[PDB]
């Protein structure tokens, strides 16, 4: 048995382009009221069907995110609307691959934002792997009863109700081997409090770095590096992009970005196949 | 549950181009000794993982075909050499999809030539679907202990020893529905004594006709139609190509040829995915 | 100016080794050395200050003990809390004619069962806690841990009651809350993040509320004697040294977390207050 890697399409989000690429079109004396753009980008997840056990990188958005009775706050829904047909929901993408959520051994939470941790609550047999400081930060938003923003109260509530098995990656812990050719990369603070990536070595495809929101897009990645409009730790963000570039070169790996529309079009998706 | 169709690469064969396209390069006064060429073409099989049960179309060549102790006769090996790495063997292609031979419900033997019926002996639980006249003709070769040619004595011997569950399609029987969107096409005599094809209707991809050796290649298909060298029933061969064209037009189906190098290159193979 | 009250919130018992590590080691003459089950006070301190009332610690929740109690049964068997109704914090404050709604700041020295038990009462105050203590306690909650020093049911109630939190940052110290009231950040030691309070009273002078940064006079020494089970042993020692330094530089008295003999000497809220 050999691994197969799947890219699952979990719909699309839109938002002010400045969130993705800070100051992408600044006002000038000639164009003082420069309008921004409302860009569309993909939300996706990666399943590695590995002989040692199934590994899921990220979990997309909860199906109960949007709408008047949705878990996401109304301002959040207005600034980051998520559009997804039933087929796009992670539970349906998995069902079409005949993969039971009960058979997922590990889930890597790159971070705990609304569009990456939305379906953690499905995976009650998995070890949920997360950066310790990201876990702390998200839990504080919950304890403070925050109803708006990128950390979703109702999602966190469900994680606790469902008694998930958590494994926290310590801030000083890196290059954590989970299975043959599967290694967690600890990027630390930058985009959020604590970012994790994944390096996957496939027999045929070779090396892949799942960067998630440590690098939103090829435009972010550069050079030159272009940071996002809201950033927790700007210096850490730059260091993390530099680290990813270094690992990519040393290991001859492709870097898969968090939300790059053009790159995502190129992926073979789970409705067509997989990477071996 | 939805069907997934897989194209499995079972290696390459070479042979005189005149076998594929009769009289492709006739001698002339200026070129009286016109040399032929030794072309290479693919051997492949198709698995339809259908919710009603797995269906296999053709079975490629037996792994014990070639070599001094192989089942194929010496002269046959010299004229139709098959080259295949271990990974190309059908049992290995199926195992990499986690499909056991015992899981196959139907095998369609398009005909009983060495490169389509080579692995029937693996499928001891399946119903083996074959044209009655093709079955009769192959069995007579066996009874005559024929050691050379396209019908392999050792393969046939193994089918009998393994007591396969044959269903013969009668010469006047056509359009045999096996499962939702899976229909057997009876082309009758032409390339061989009795040729079967399959029409597959997939939700997304639409209609596919699996022609096997009723149409070797796009060059065979034309227009103009170009018949193969060595042909059992030349009138039936033409009738069958015209039947395939008619069905393809009426159902808006793509025709997948038996041995077309360029078409085969375009297929998504089982190492990369499937058609839905 | 301000009045300071010491409120008696009952008594707890536990293995002495929890308080003083290796207090009575086995020897060849005494290979099966027995320990003892010591008793100590749980208490809280109210400072009635003109700029707003400040409460240091909150004792145990009235619903802690019993078959239906919030504390886990192993926890109740190892750290049993005994308290009459009049010992409950809500009753101690009622006797002082202080409304819980009138507490401006509550200082959570840390989030252990016997200090954070009644945070949920104070839905109008700012609850002040070390950021790393808050994080740690919240992780135990998210993991649904029902035994130990961090009480799942208490935490559940802080969240359900929508308390107003102010986290003291890891590198933040000497935080003036009011004239003569300063938060002392001791950091990691006994727990993930310990806070103390320096109180300057007009007549009594300086008081340092150490809570569990220093359990007792025997802990404080010299020589310093650390507790059994300790988060950060180096930090624990550094914090005791810090307290000794501040006490000497400010001429302040150090009030320990759980010292039976010291607690007996305090003027209790039922008799009067400090000025
Ligand atoms: Co993000
Ligand atoms: Co994102
Ligand atoms: Co043939
Ligand atoms: Co053939
Ligand atoms: Co304590
Ligand atoms: Co204590």
Author numbering:
A (entry chain H), B (entry chain A): 8 to 283
C (entry chain L): 9 to 283
Can you list sentences taken from the study reporting this PDB entry?
AaL (WP_021296945.1) is a lactonase isolated from the acidophilic, moderately thermostable bacterium Alicyclobacillus acidoterrestris. The quorum quenching lactonase AaL from the thermoacidophilic bacterium Alicyclobacillus acidoterrestris exhibits a very broad substrate range, being capable of hydrolyzing short and long chain AHLs with high proficiencies. AaL possesses a bi-metallic active site center. We show that AaL is capable of degrading δ-lactones and γ-lactones with high catalytic proficiency (>104 M−1 s−1) and shows some weak, promiscuous phosphotriesterase activity on the insecticide-derivated paraoxon. The crystal structure of AaL reveals a unique hydrophobic patch which could relate to its high specificity, and highlights a flexible active site loop which may be involved in substrate binding.
Examination of one of the obtained AaL structure reveals the presence of a tetrahedral molecule in the active site, as clearly illustrated by the electronic density. Similarly to what was observed in the AiiB structure, this density was attributed to a phosphate anion. In this structure, the α-metal is bridged with H118, H120, H198, D220 and two phosphate oxygen atoms, while the β-metal is bound to H123, H266, D122, D220 and two oxygen atoms from the phosphate anion. With the bound phosphate, the bridging water molecule is not present in the metal coordination. Interestingly, the phosphate-bound AaL and AiiB structures differ in the way they coordinate the anion. However, in the case of AaL, the corresponding residue, a leucine, does not interact with the bound anion. In fact, metal coordination is affected and the distance between both metal cations varies greatly between the two enzymes (3.5 Å and 4.2 Å in AaL and AiiB, respectively, for the two phosphate-bound structures).
